[PDB]
Amino acid sequence: MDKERLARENHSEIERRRRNKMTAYITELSDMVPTCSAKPDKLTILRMAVSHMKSLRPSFLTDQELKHLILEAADGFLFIVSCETGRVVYVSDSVTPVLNQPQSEWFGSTLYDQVHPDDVDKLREQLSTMGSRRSFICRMRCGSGEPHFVVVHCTGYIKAWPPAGVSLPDDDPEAGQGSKFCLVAIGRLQPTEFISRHNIEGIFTFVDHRCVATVGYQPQELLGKNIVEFCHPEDQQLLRDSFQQVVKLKGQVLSVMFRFRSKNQEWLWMRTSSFTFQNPYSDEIEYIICTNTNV
Amino acid sequence: SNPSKRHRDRLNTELDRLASLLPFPQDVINKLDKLSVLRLSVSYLRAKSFFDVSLKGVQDNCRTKFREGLNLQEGEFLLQALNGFVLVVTTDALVFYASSTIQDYLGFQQSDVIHQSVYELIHTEDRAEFQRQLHFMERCFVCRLRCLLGFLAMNFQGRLKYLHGQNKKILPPQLALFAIATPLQPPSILEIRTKNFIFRTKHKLDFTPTGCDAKGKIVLGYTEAELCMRGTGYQFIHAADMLYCAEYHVRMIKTGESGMIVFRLLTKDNRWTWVQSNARLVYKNGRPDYIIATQRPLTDEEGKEHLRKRTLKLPFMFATGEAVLYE
DNA sequence: CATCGGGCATCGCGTGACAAG
DNA sequence: GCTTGTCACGCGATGCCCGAT
Ligand SMILES: O=C1C(c2[nH]c3ccccc3c2O)=Nc2ccccc21
């Protein structure tokens, strides 16, 4: 219709919406300041809001409020370790509700001293040499009994040391460390078939993703482990005999039925057919190929 | 003057007083319009009212001055370690809070996002999904959010907790989502310098690597000594490709030339990377001596296309999975 | 104990200048 | 050279206040 009239009407309603939103925000303010909601016009509401904000008062939140929101969102504890030696430079008090460890067991300690030995090598990989992030999974010791380990997902980044704005006094323990880079990270707790490849000992070295649908484990939860570790004790030597026999009979297929402990710690009957892959030049066994099927 | 002008001047005076008190740098405050002044003052009051209920240190057997400064920055350190941003959303889908790092990941300013509807940041096709997360307590999902640097798919890991001290009308507190948003992850090494990153490897007759050039070290991630101490290259090859590579190894044994073959190699990161390669036999006194394989890295798209158009059919051709490698 | 007119303050509306994008 | 939004302004309809009935 008339382009000038429609422009005018759109503009008038835009200004009307603006006025309405201003009024709504002023009502919110009246709800948010002390003596108001306990009735006042716009000017007194604004003056009381000014006074209340002067009371309350650059970041929108304090450091403590930010930390509170992050930990309320997804738990975790902060640690700052040095890359050359794994030396724990800082640990948050959140390590107590996460690992049931006091802050005192991580200070003067090393990240290698706090993880499972089978993981220490991996740790070095993560500590050697957007924003150069790091994302890994490890096993950390806990309170306890005997040694107690829990899987911990770690998310962090490499930071040039020392950090800006933080005073490093002359007589501080950190004064003679001289570490150049540090890892700053958060640690947080927590009928088909699939193919796989193993070495002649039975260690998972390739795992099809369909493992999740077949036995409930992620591929990372199987790789590196021996298949016999997931097999029923009364089927374990049968499975081992099959693995040792398939090596003697290269090319021939061997089938074996056994109980596989799913991740629900439930026994599932599995039929595994296995054969060897021969190196086409030297005829040596490269690995054992298994098809593992639900029964 | 006139009474209308006087009242408007009083209102603007109070609005400027509110603006100067906002906890933002002055360059941010000076660019704020009046509606955003009110919106952010309401934001600050709601935040403070909540923290008054919900909120409130190194162990004294551990306290150094340096550790005390680190403790004073603990929250920022957590935020930087997030690899993402904090989001807190009300039942009314309003952004109760967003950390500053949202600008690092989506390009939105913190002062623009707070106390606006979260759906303005979320893809339409995903908005419904987000709503079902806003209404037994933990949450883990995926949503595509607007990226002004355009969308990025983000993992949201969070929780539903009661947002205290909001003085809704006297209503009880409603559940808000306290989430951390991070980007997604792909498991394949695609070369950025895709063009002519040709690298050559030397191998024994059984394809055990014995030599590698610099571009090979960059692509695969192994040191030369690491590459040669892990058995034959069949330990490096995807299970969906091993039979094809074996056939082409036979072809090379019989004719000295393998021909072009596309397959996946396991990087030191335990990631798969596509390569188009050609393996040639070098001879000593007329007898096979070693192999020289020359490889070009491929994007995942080109690799999938080659696999889709593959010549032979062999078992495990379409299998996908993960691998490891020892010595 | 009200009710009643003054005059100024509040408050919602539409329009015009101006500018970022 | 158009679109969307911010800001001020003019303008009445009520609001509040308070001597004066
Ligand atoms: O290029 C290779 C190849 C190969 N290259 C590699 C480089 C580094 C590590 C392992 C390997 C490896 O296994 N194996 C083939 C079989 C048939 C034709 C071509 C090739």
Side-chain angles (χ1 to χ4, degrees), chain A residues 33-264:
Chain A
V33 313
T35 76
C36 215
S37 37
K39 263 42 192 213
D41 68 327
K42 291 175 181 169
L43 275 177
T44 78
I45 295 171
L46 291 172
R47 293 192 258 256
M48 293 173 179
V50 163
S51 269
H52 187 58
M53 268 187 71
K54 261 174 13 189
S55 284
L56 298 171
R57 298 217 57 212
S59 291
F60 186 83
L61 312 172
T62 61
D63 194 77
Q64 280 297 130
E65 289 160 351
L66 176 57
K67 160 183 176 175
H68 184 63
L69 289 190
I70 294 174
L71 300 181
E72 229 63 28
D75 294 311
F77 78 99
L78 179 84
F79 62 95
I80 297 174
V81 297
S82 73
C83 305
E84 74 280 358
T85 167
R87 173 187 60 95
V88 173
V89 182
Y90 184 83
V91 64
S92 71
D93 54 359
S94 293
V95 75
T96 303
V98 168
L99 302 179
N100 193 25
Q101 303 276 15
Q103 275 172 88
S104 104
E105 167 93 42
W106 278 51
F107 287 121
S109 177
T110 286
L111 185 65
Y112 304 118
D113 290 337
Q114 298 297 346
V115 304
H116 191 241
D118 293 354
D119 291 304
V120 57
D121 265 8
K122 174 163 60 164
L123 252 67
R124 305 185 190 276
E125 234 166 317
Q126 296 299 330
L127 294 194
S128 148
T129 58
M130 204 206 185
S132 64
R133 315 289 324 197
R134 300 295 143 94
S135 210
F136 60 94
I137 293 159
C138 80
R139 289 173 275 168
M140 299 191 179
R141 318 178 195 257
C142 303
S144 210
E146 260 176 40
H148 182 196
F149 289 75
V150 171
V151 180
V152 166
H153 300 235
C154 293
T155 304
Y157 65 100
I158 303 303
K159 177 176 190 52
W161 218 238
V166 192
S167 198
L168 179 38
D170 289 344
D171 61 357
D172 194 276
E174 183 74 5
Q177 289 306 339
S179 321
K180 315 145 219 67
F181 298 107
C182 271
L183 174 65
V184 181
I186 309 177
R188 297 182 176 91
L189 290 197
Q190 264 158 351
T192 324
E193 66 184 18
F194 72 99
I195 73 168
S196 60
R197 302 190 320 205
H198 312 249
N199 53 33
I200 62 179
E201 297 81 29
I203 294 285
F204 280 101
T205 61
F206 179 98
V207 175
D208 184 346
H209 290 130
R210 292 174 296 161
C211 66
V212 175
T214 307
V215 292
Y217 299 88
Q218 286 290 316
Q220 315 298 324
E221 320 195 72
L222 307 174
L223 293 157
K225 310 257 188 199
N226 204 288
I227 192 178
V228 182
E229 304 171 28
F230 300 84
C231 167
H232 198 278
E234 298 175 270
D235 317 329
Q236 278 188 349
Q237 193 65 309
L238 171 62
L239 187 52
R240 289 178 203 148
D241 296 354
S242 207
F243 261 76
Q244 313 314 320
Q245 265 291 110
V246 82
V247 167
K248 307 184 188 121
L249 287 63
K250 49 174 48 171
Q252 316 254 338
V253 186
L254 258 73
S255 270
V256 51
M257 288 201 60
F258 71 97
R259 281 158 285 192
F260 196 107
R261 186 156 210 81
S262 64
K263 193 176 45 208
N264 315 334

